[PDB]
Assembly symmetry: D2
């Protein structure tokens, strides 16, 4: 039978299956992908270790991969983002998953290592990564197993301390050569997110990347949809569920005006806030001003905004000094990927009063307070349900095609140990698969029209440098 999982509560599986089924209707790209490739079973023989937010949307991805023949083990890539009913449904479907909403950082890393303990013996031969954590376990352990262990002795953060301790433990406990075995078996890794892509390009440029990688983040139908439209929908959802505050009449500050900040500022303005923005990039700042946002510094915003959202991917955006200047019961949250955008650690010796899960009131010596959401981690996934299914279908269709590329379309070793992106025609295919469900009717070029603009009728329609 099947017992190989760790979830909050398996009795949530029925509720998970109901919402998965509903999500399927909202994820036409993944469902069409099942129909197209189901008969050819291109992932038969794949052993996919997946590390990505264990949500309802990711469940539809998991089952798509399975529908295509893949064998799978899964973990979440964040401690708070798991939806426990999604995890229980996957476990009940007989797929190993180690994901609990609110697991500790120590648990998180121990679960990541369970990805590589393949059921029935052996290791994975594919990785599907969001943030590069599974990829980093392999590379760090390989590095150390070869004899370069110095870096493990000097961790740079609390989380890095736990991660390095994991690598040491695995080196002690596993058979000699375990990391080299893993690295040689991985046929490829498709990476979802800017932080992991950064790690890939760094490894690729030092010659230490161990297997081919596909950068799904820079697919057009990911990077121009996922956070732009996803954050537009899910950022205010998080804030409403956390606080139930009236947004009309409030002033909000968004730090950063990349894809995440863009979608986040739109979410708050559409909901009725008067939105201010900070930026270090003069082009991004100009975009913000042209969209009608006042562009200011955090020192300017600190005493006056009602709501603060960090969206920079940098560190020390909202400091202790900012939060001391904040008005009483100002709301503070983060939708960047790490919890160091806000100086959370500097608040830990203040009085915290829990309101409900992922909502805390923090009181300062002068007795003014702030409302912190999700302890300064991803507010959309921590306080609500993350991005809705339809946009995640686009990202996850890219992931599915990327797995097929690496696992089934590398007979000629067109993918070496470097970072690739999907070709534009597959990118366009992802979009195509999502048009019928929302009633889009695409115009077909006549031959004379296609020649007139220098494209084939069937695409690709734009050069590879086109920015959309």
């Amino acid at each position: 039978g099947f017992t190989d999982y760790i979830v909050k509560d398996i009795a949530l599986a029925d509720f998970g299956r109901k919402e998965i089924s509903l999500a399927e209707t909202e994820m036409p790209g993944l469902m069409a992908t099942r129909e197209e490739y189901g008969p050819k079973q291109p992932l038969k023989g794949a052993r996919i270790a997946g590390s990505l937010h264990m949500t309802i949307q990711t469940a539809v991805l998991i089952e798509t991969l399975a529908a295509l023949g893949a064998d799978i083990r899964w973990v979440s890539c964040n401690i708070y983002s798991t939806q426990d009913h999604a995890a229980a449904a996957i476990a009940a479907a007989g797929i190993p998953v180690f994901a609990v909403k609110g697991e500790t950082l120590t648990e998180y890393w121990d679960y990541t290592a369970k990805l590589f303990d393949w059921h029935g013996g052996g290791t994975p031969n594919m990785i599907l990564d969001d943030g590069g954590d599974a990829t980093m376990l392999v590379h760090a352990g390989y590095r150390a197993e070869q004899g370069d262990t110095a870096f493990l002795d000097k961790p740079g953060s609390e989380e890095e301390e736990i991660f390095y301790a994991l690598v040491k433990r695995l080196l002690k406990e596993k058979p000699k050569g375990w990391f080299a075995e893993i690295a040689k078996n991985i046929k490829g890794v498709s990476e979802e997110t800017t932080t992991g892509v950064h790690r890939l390009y760094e490894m690729a440029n030092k010659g230490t990347l161990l297997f081919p990688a596909i950068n799904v983040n820079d697919s057009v139908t990911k990077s121009k949809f996922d956070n732009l439209y996803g954050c537009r929908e899910s950022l205010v959802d998080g804030i409403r569920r956390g606080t139930d505050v009236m947004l009309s009449g409030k002033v909000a500050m968004v730090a950063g005006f990349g894809d995440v900040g863009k979608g986040s500022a739109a979410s708050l303005r559409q909901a009725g806030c008067r939105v201010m923005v900070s930026e270090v990039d003069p082009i991004c700042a100009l975009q913000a001003a042209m969209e009608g946002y006042e562009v200011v510094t955090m020192e300017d915003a600190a005493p006056r905004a009602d709501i603060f959202v960090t969206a920079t991917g940098n560190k020390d955006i909202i400091t202790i000094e900012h939060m001391r200047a904040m008005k009483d019961r100002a709301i503070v949250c983060n939708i960047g990927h790490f919890d160091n955008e806000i100086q959370i650690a500097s608040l830990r010796n203040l009085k915290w009063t829990n309101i409900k899960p992922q909502v805390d009131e923090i009181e300062f010596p002068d007795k003014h307070r702030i409302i912190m959401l999700s302890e300064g981690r991803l507010v959309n996934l921590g306080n609500a349900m993350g991005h809705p299914s339809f946009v995640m279908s686009a990202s996850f269709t890219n992931q599915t095609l990327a797995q097929i590329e690496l696992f089934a379309n590398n007979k000629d070793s067109k993918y070496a140990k470097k970072v690739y992106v999907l070709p534009k025609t597959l990118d366009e295919k992802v979009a195509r698969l999502h048009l019928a469900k929302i009633g889009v009717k695409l115009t077909e070029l006549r031959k004379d029209q296609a020649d007139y603009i220098g494209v084939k009728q069937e695409g690709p329609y734009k050069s590879d440098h086109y920015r959309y």
Copy 2:
């Protein structure tokens, strides 16, 4: 000291959580908190015995505790079977105030609880009613009518709810002392009422001469049309739909039936969240407004096969029928933000297969296997699937309610309020708005005396004629 038992809530252990969100809400309701400060010293509701029937939310908890802070004795129920927020109800019970309200109580339970308002703790009856939808008011008048001998109507129910209500009146007539409804009627000093249907029926009883006590219509305050209905629904309609379904709104088509103030706010809610919004209307002025706001104005027959989301906002009946729902696309979402559960023909769906997804979310399957997603069984979706309107906008409505309670209870020594329906003056509308400006950082300009004279108003207001529409 002694153990308090005079309540019915889901779980008393939610009281600490309720108290926490009540405290947060106080900061967001400056109108109520200022009213506490102003009238606290004079205790204008000392001696008031207020029976309240209003959605037992966090926001209503602040209203309740405002009434109490002004001296009132209180018993409370919700006015909708799904609108209660169980932590708010628990906090009120823990404060020793009788409350009978559970999210997801049945209709039969609902009406039993309404009756409990009138059994005053320690003896006697209420002497004030704070009503939302007229249910407490109707119980008194229907019982009085039957107690006086006119009983035929009790055997003529037009809905399941009327069946249950008429059964309740019959039971109360059998169980309570003779003359009970007359006694209640004699002791009620006034009612304040917030809703369009509640107000409609007050005016109708007034014209018929059957209204039993003075009434104040707070529904025609500028607050209800221009703030509560408009901005509340703009904020809370999509909230309800998101929590119920987690669907992506960008890319979807939505249909809103009605374009009065609730449909205005509802359509705005959906458009701001990224839907393409269509609207239906029977009023050509309201329809022309919708068109001018950029909404396509179509019939429900037109909308039925093509919208992804349907929202009823008409206050009328039989808006979305069994025929319309048969024609909808698979897994269209249907919900109601008008006040009664008959805008959608929910009763005609009960012979079909219902699969419950989670509280207030059900998937309904037709014989051709096509499905719809029904929110809150056709009842107020913002309150059923989410947390209703946010605290800041309820502050103004609830300040109006408090002011109306003061007027009827404390300011009727001269009988300025007969057995008729009255409205608060514009000076109160301006004062209530003014109480909210500082919280959201509004800097009001002060007219100089010459500018005041030039436009023909006093520097302190009122600034508009009484027929001004804002």
Copy 3:
């Protein structure tokens, strides 16, 4: 040989006729009114003196009145609002009109007086007024003729001085008792505008109103459409034609948040400005705040807005002190109806440099400059073309119906010397006449549904105090 007119240049008549024809297609309420009432000729025998912005839209109103049997003389109610080609077309059709874009204030009032010199002898018997200027001429003259002359020597502005000069001249030049003769013959006035309606109530309150009046301003289908949607379209139109400035990136200040201020703030926001608002009314200030506008004082706004729009109906809103504090080349304009919202008179000792018609640059002693549009008068009509035809059709269908009421439907004296409003049944009918052109499909109440909400199937649908 028709000579009884004054226009800038009669050669523009052909161009005027073409745009009048286009506007008819855009004004279905007026054209439906011609079809319904043409056979009966209810305005046969009416002698309408009209004082209302001589635009293409007003030309369609004029010709609607004429199609119903009216004899007409016409003037503009503002010195910059005339569209010279519309005026030419009216004159070319044999209708006396005295309206030149850019006429002087003295000419303006001379022209108002010509309304009452009926061609072929006599006086008018109806007034259609916008702003109350023609009504005021009759009442001030009557007042003085009856012996109460002192006010004629107490002017408080240049315009009052000119108006009182006109009254003195007419009393010297016309037959004794002329004003009483006019007053006796005017069957009614219909008044369009808040300023004129306030003049009407003053006089009705005092018992000095000389004839019945219908307040068209407070039709729903005027005051919930005319200013709200008209200014939303025409305010930025005026600013763009006058200055061609980029509105995205700029900050705008709107004084006033009545229906003109509501429409004006909307126009600017939709055009990409960040909009701020001043108000004295806490209900309107709270509306503005709930719509996401920052509500501030003009002292706060003066050094930081790029664009200033007064919309108050009050005086001394933007002062010389405000304008000295403004940034170099800030834009200032007015869409309230006088020209004392901004302190224009106080600017007349400064160096003015004309850029083009209705656009001037005013230089202060410190060399900073402001850009003044239409000399502080109505900016949508002065720098552009006013509200677009469609929304004016609703207002002007109201006017036509009000003229019919007073002229043809007062045989029983239901309208005494007081101010009346059109009934809601007519208001709903005005709305109905515009629905098909924009493709609205109205739902029809079934009888049980009409009974359920307490209305007749055919309306009216709302109580008389409903605010929409």
Copy 4:
């Protein structure tokens, strides 16, 4: 004094100078570029032949180039886009310019040729091009001079035959080797638009590009600003001036959802239209749908839109059949670069009635009509004033830096006979120069923060593939 120009009326110079002065305040990037490079005179010795819309904004660019030392001759790149007062001011400043609003196609091309007859003898040594017309004349003439003349006899449109007639006339009239002489002396071309850049890459890929090229279109601070925000402001402006129609209540159709179509659809939605879009590219279609636009075919839109806007860069988008099915008095216009998106030529057999400059009513035999703007040419520039100055300052600051690059910074032959874009640091500087004018306050990265995200504090802040 100075005689070498062709403009509509030199008396318009004073008016031109006033609006240029006003634009200078609105174009800080250009004025700051004058401040920075003026003392260096980087364009001393430059002989720039410019082909670009002779607007007020282009005047500031021309005078900027002159201020940096350039000798200049100029023409418009469209027969309707000239602003006559701008042209007159330029002429009056002593700069040869040949640009009249409403010039004929034959005049247009004859003027283009006048660019290359340099005043005082010789040829230009730089080209500043918008749409590649000046570039094409040089390369077409070279190709024929080299002996490949067959193409000049196979024309396909009216403008094509005029262009080939021009080339033949110049070959016949000028000395032998004239185009080779021009090509030898052209140091570089900077090109502003998609159409022109497309021609450039094609020539560069065939080895036939005759001189270095900089593609200014794909600067981020051009492509993500110019038509995104420019069309958002200027498309409805053109429609309003041309027709004065109420946009609220109306349905509009935009063909295309590239940057021009994105900005155009926004222009119409913000003005109050319900907006439908067509697309052939499924990614762009998905973008339109996610922004809430209904995505339809032209066959679907033809009988129900009130307003049609072509923005595809393609041909045969709105056909005679489409137009026969449009409702009476539908508005039709084009904001793509040539007049073949709409089948204007097929309309030349019907009754055209001119309303006013650039506005025509076209009658079909069944008497239904359409309103055509600018005879199907660039509506924002033909019916109004094009993009406002502020956004053009960014475009034109890029142009100035491109001319400096090619003329003054090619001592090491870093620019060969291929197409280049400006470096990201210069792109960032362009945005930087515009921030203060709109009150943007940019955050400065701390050293530790810049390290953390992998950039220098002074930028570049994004990789070269970042899409913004």
